[PDB]
């Protein structure tokens, strides 16, 4: 058992091969499946797991009523093996949480679960399931974190948290965590930027995060930093705008794009020099479809020209959150950090006529062998009996 | 595999971080979850587990009827991982039981399960699941034990059992157990005191139990003892009365407080010199709400002043039993024994219009980092389909 | 990993302490629990498991119809941990079977599953889940075996099978099995005896079996043998008759007792010199109640006097099959082979008005510490929804 | 962990002993069991597993509707222990897949899952659950593979895939795979032959596959090859025709038998010099019944005489796909590779009045000890509540 090095570079990839699909909402029509949202995948050196925030309720049961609501004392962070439906009969309990992150350092799992009131929430940190630290709201306004895996390099794990309004300037902090203990934190000097729900990955011993600007950006903000949390900030320049909502593609910007910039969705991108692989919704106005786009100058260039598009979910199908996850050399035997991604397929409120909201997931891993575009949607037939 | 030392002091703590919530009643509306009461938590050097008394029945099925009744031949002690719902599909069988205790000495689990008739019940003790001893009622009036973890120091484990009436003087025995074999017991000389449902923990090689006076005490009795079962007795002196029911807070006593003293609820407290961390309901008359209070002179002083209160369950929400559990340094890597606690959130009879009674649970661990009060209640909407 | 020696003697016991209870029929009212009959318990050096023959159907579902029927191609031998309900979500598959045995030699499990036609059934033998032998019907008339654990001594396991009519002379064979291969078999010369559903245990390197005489005996037949299968035969002499049905107690006999001798129930007894611990039903006419009786001269003496009676199930409660199981020193750390027993609590047809028949279980281990009689019945309220 | 040698010969067998039956459809009347088809069994050096293609839906739920359809984005390759029902609570996720194969090389599991569109499907290969390679359709017409285990010899695993029309000449490729990487493939020169759904097994370091001619053969095509993918081709010569549909038995041919040759069913056979063990349906026109036949000159001789027949499923009962699996010496301790087989028992559409199609399974292993013919059918009573 050894710490993940995290010192190799990301594997360059040409396409995305399908890795998992859980069908949770379809199975939940009869089976005992948690109502969940905000799922994500994270791997150890031995396995990949899906983490998710339950609503303390099963699908097709009356307790799923009102699960559009984001924060309650019932919500818990749990995990199961990748591609299995999240059930009380296969799910490991992690934390009481309405916002979370998790990652494995090579030795044990770090989990971060935030609960408590909007005016004073507390992140509880656990290492191997023992509480090892806490951090409390410093702006008293919905302390919130990634909803995806943290990133680890040589025994240190890193995450981003946000505290403040969701329609204006907020405060953003970056953390270094070792064996579940916060050993350093810094508050970002980022005037006119906004960051939340960051998707962060390791790459050549450094951390890159691509986040959501809910304030006034239709492109995605990024922050990268080293083990000492010395950081750099920007927005993805590509005119292939990554957020949802967003305008139609056109010339981009290296700061925040204000057009359709308010609101957003969690997402990700991978940086390869001046190029970028963007995952995004296919619809500009709602969480519908999903596609991956390789723009070989999109990190720093502002044109809307790109070279590869691979379909993942069809434009008439419900999508949702998406996030990065990696497979390290210690897991794969490769000489590089493999990029993967998951997509959350949201069903129910607000877009459908149900009492509940819940998601399934799909996930894909980067390869340089042949791949194909298609649509792998949630597949459930709504409404359900309970509705 | 090594014996827990049990020789360090209790970790000093400033507040309580949420550790687990299982949502059992919410989930059992649809899923297959045991009807249970008398849950508790106990840890080995490798994991923590929820122990509970089943009713041999599942939520929202007809055999849930009558489960207000405490003692039957159908009740079984079973256990599942912390924060998971207790289900037939995830629960390990421990013992046939309508009163129980369990604790891990560092090598194997000890379990104590009392079944049989009210006039001659028998505790069956198991070590690693094998029957290693029995002990029979010696007063023929409902032999009963902790309903929370026993406590272990250097390969010996300790518990308390009571036999006799619940509305007057009863008999109270302390036991030293090694590899599931009773090696010593003493009957306590405790005239005008009453002990049941003790929450016992180790602290610097000695055991301290805080219990329930069902006879005539609205404050809690305590007994502390060494590995030779040489014991000291007393009641918590604080005017912050710990039992339910109780009077409003006023000047306390170091003997039993007779005002509102009859009846009770299982609870716990932690001694820190002359100070005390008290867990109690928020209502003085029913099992509603829960709070943690630090009273720096409350173990020995009778005033009703305290220095810290942390809300756990709101006053208008159902609560129930509570107990202590510890995390030893062999589990955590700390230099001290960490105090934690669980609360049972009882739903159904006698307070609600159901045919059944069952609980869910929440637990917290003591920390010195930032924490917050809130309410994490059961959350189920009663009555259910079967009612 | 080492072979069970099997060379110590049975632990003398003074009473029976309750070990497990599954509540399967109560739980199966809503949960996903197999319809089963013919359960039994068997232990390895690490754990005890319950084996059972499913009917390829779940309780309270339409496929449980007609499960009074003994033999079908749907019936399977499965196992789960002791005291858990048998569900498809916790159950290990063993063999396709309508009659069975299993036992662990210290290294691996042996399972014996008989299926196929009444006129040519085949026992399939498996070691560690691999098929290692078969034995086919030699009288073409329902080849059948113990429905309880086989017995192992020094790497050899032993069982008994029967082939022929159930209302007359049949044929009875004894088998020695090593690593799942039949290494010797003998046909018993036992004119005027009848043996089936033998409960067999090791004791001082030899096997004792106590069986069912369905032809013309209301006491139980026995056969004991060494590793070479050189055997002796007799019937339990005590006037405390062990079978069901049977007459009221009176002077017994050392050969078959013809009064109420046709028909029967699987059962067991333990021999301790000239004395016997007898488990039997409390009713003389039907499968109701259960009790254990220590008769200090009952193996070889014919009087109906006895020393100890311990109630297990009350006379107005349903019982059923019962069988021996042992815990070897390699499991317990004792210097003797510990005797235990289980009882099948049968519900449904033919005594109740249901479409199905299915059983739960209770089990007890022998101890020399204090015990108590009680009733631990099945507890389900019939009929069920499906009826 | 050591690589399976795969260099010994097939064990000679006189008959087939029943190994497993899962009763999936019967159990899924109430419990949470996947709608599935295309099951198959494959073994590591430590256990045997059932692999199957789910429909992303449970039996007796509305999302089972339309499951006659073969290919969708919801289908997933998943696995559970042999003989257990495939449930979301006991099944391991393998791959997104509407056509599949898997096999264990002695060190790790290889899985092959084809998803994507009919005009450009992609097989995703995983080794130990990590994506190790992909291969894309090369004729753009439903890339498809074995629906049974691939075959392994000294660290290399072999499979066959087909691409093109199912009512005419298509293209057939053989693959050598090492640690989940395709290291060699060849396209077969096979004019006038047709191969799909190959059942492949190792025998003396070489692979023999018996497949389905959906174009114009009522006998089965075979291809055998060495580790270099040097291959020989042929059809089974026996006038005991192996496909469904087929003619009644008459003189066979060593080329495709065109009488009733169109359409087909996945099946298997085992070669023993000039002889052959044939598994087939009992009906000549529909997937009903199953029997095993030993024809001592049937691999190369065209007569319709055989030496042994062993009933498996009766003629009036539903059957389906069948395939081979092996137990290598590293698992059994034998000196030869043991042949086994499974049969899928298909229920629902198109033959029955349901909204859904699903299968259960049975399997058998080859022995030289005594065996018996019988019928072990699915057993479920259709239609179901949902229909
Ligand atoms: C939760 O649990 C409670 C407590 O048990 C249930 O309340 C019981 O409900 C049952 C069923 O309704 C009651 O049992 C019934 O009693 C009837 C009347 O019994 C008395 O009066 C008759 C004369 O009419 C006398 O013959 C008899 O000796 C009694 O003095 C009976 O008529 C019913 O009998 C029928 O069913 C039985 C099954 O054994 C048949 O054998 C009979 O022939 C007959 O067909 C029946 O026994 C019982 O009294 C209630 N108990 C209490 C304490 O009130 C709740 O119903 C339950 N709730 C839910 C939701 O399940
Ligand atoms: C339920 O089982 C009954 C019997 O209890 C079924 O009736 C027939 O099939 C059985 C085969 O197992 C036999 O046991 C019966 O003797 C036989 N004939 C009868 C009762 O006349 C009956 O068809 C089944 N019920 C349902 C709902 O299908
Ligand atoms: C709290 C503001 C933030 C951005 C608007 O809300 C997020 C939006 C969500 C969304 O856009 O779907 C779902 C997240 N669960 C929620 N996070 C929390 C902590 O409640
Ligand atoms: C036996 C008397 C005792 C104190 C009143 O009853 C306890 C009270 C209970 C309670 O106050 O909720 C529930 C406990 N399950 C019960 N213990 C037993 C062994 O039945
Ligand atoms: C086969 C005759 C035998 C004795 C009457 O029947 C047994 C009786 C039974 C019984 O008396 O309850 C149940 C057993 N499952 C059955 N065994 C078999 C193989 O069917
Ligand atoms: C694609 C052609 C092929 C042969 C007709 O269809 C198969 C026939 C099937 C059948 O005959 O039952 C079911 C298989 N699931 C299907 N394979 C695929 C990949 O869909
Ligand atoms: C990465 O870290 C490993 C393990 O410590 C080290 O041996 C190696 O020199 C470093 N870099 C690369 C790119 O392999
Ligand atoms: C959902 O909650 C609303 C408002 O509290 C209520 O009207 C409705 O009955 C609920 N539906 C269900 C199925 O519980
Ligand atoms: C990794 O961390 C360890 C322990 O802090 C340290 O010894 C080592 O130098 C670090 N390696 C790098 C490349 O930073
Ligand atoms: C506690 O016990 C340990 C382990 O036996 C021993 O080595 C140590 O000296 C003791 N520590 C304290 C704080 O008393
Ligand atoms: C712990 O127990 C062992 C065995 O009884 C004993 O030798 C040792 O002295 C004990 N340690 C203490 C500190 O009591
Ligand atoms: C039992 O067998 C053990 C282990 O082989 C042996 O050491 C011992 O002598 C035997 N005991 C008796 C009483 O025969
Ligand atoms: C037990 O079996 C082994 C191996 O056959 C043999 O060597 C040994 O003598 C046997 N022991 C006894 C006590 O018979
Ligand atoms: C097969 O291979 C094994 C292991 O490599 C070797 O030892 C043996 O000689 C070979 N066996 C046969 C039957 O050829
Ligand atoms: C099944 O699917 C068909 C086609 O969409 C539809 O017409 C039918 O109503 C569905 N039936 C059920 C019972 O859901
Ligand atoms: Ca935005
Ligand atoms: Ca560009
Ligand atoms: Ca009191
Ligand atoms: Ca005070
Ligand atoms: Ca008899
Ligand atoms: Ca006597
Ligand atoms: Ca259910
Ligand atoms: Ca054909
Ligand atoms: Ca021939
Ligand atoms: Na009956």
Author numbering:
A (entry chain B), B (entry chain C), C (entry chain D), D (entry chain A): 82 to 468
Paper lines:
Three variants (H275Y, H275Y/I223V, and H275Y/S247N NA2009) crystallized in the monoclinic space group with four molecules in the asymmetric unit, representing the tetrameric biological unit. In enzyme variants containing H275Y in combination with the I223V or S247N mutation, an oseltamivir pose similar to that found in H275Y was observed. The RMSD for superposition of oseltamivir atoms in the H275Y, H275Y/I223V, and H275Y/S247N NA2009 variant was below 0.11 Å. We conclude that structural changes caused by the individual mutations have a coacting effect on increase of oseltamivir resistance, reflected in the more than three-fold increase in Ki in H275Y/I223V NA2009 compared to H275Y NA2009. The double mutations I223V/H275Y and S247N/H275Y led to dramatic increases in Ki values (3900- and 9000-fold higher than wt, respectively). We observed only moderately decreased catalytic efficiency (kcat/Km) for the single mutants I223V and S247N, and much lower values for all variants containing the H275Y substitution (only 4–6% of the wt value for the H275Y, I223V/H275Y, and S247N/H275Y mutants). The decrease in sensitivity to oseltamivir conferred by these single mutations alone is moderate, but when combined with the H275Y mutation, the double mutants have a greatly enhanced oseltamivir-resistant phenotype (1733-fold for H275Y/I223V and 7000-fold for H275Y/S247N compared to the recombinant wt virus).
NA is a homotetrameric transmembrane glycoprotein responsible for cleavage of sialic acid from the host cell membrane. By blocking NA enzymatic activity, neuraminidase inhibitors (NAIs) prevent new viral particles from being released from the surface of an infected cell, thus stopping the spread of virus in the airways. In this study, we applied a set of experimental techniques using recombinant NA variants to understand the molecular basis of development of oseltamivir resistance in the viral N1 neuraminidase NA2009. To decipher the structural mechanism of resistance, we determined crystal structures of NA2009 mutants in complex with oseltamivir carboxylate.
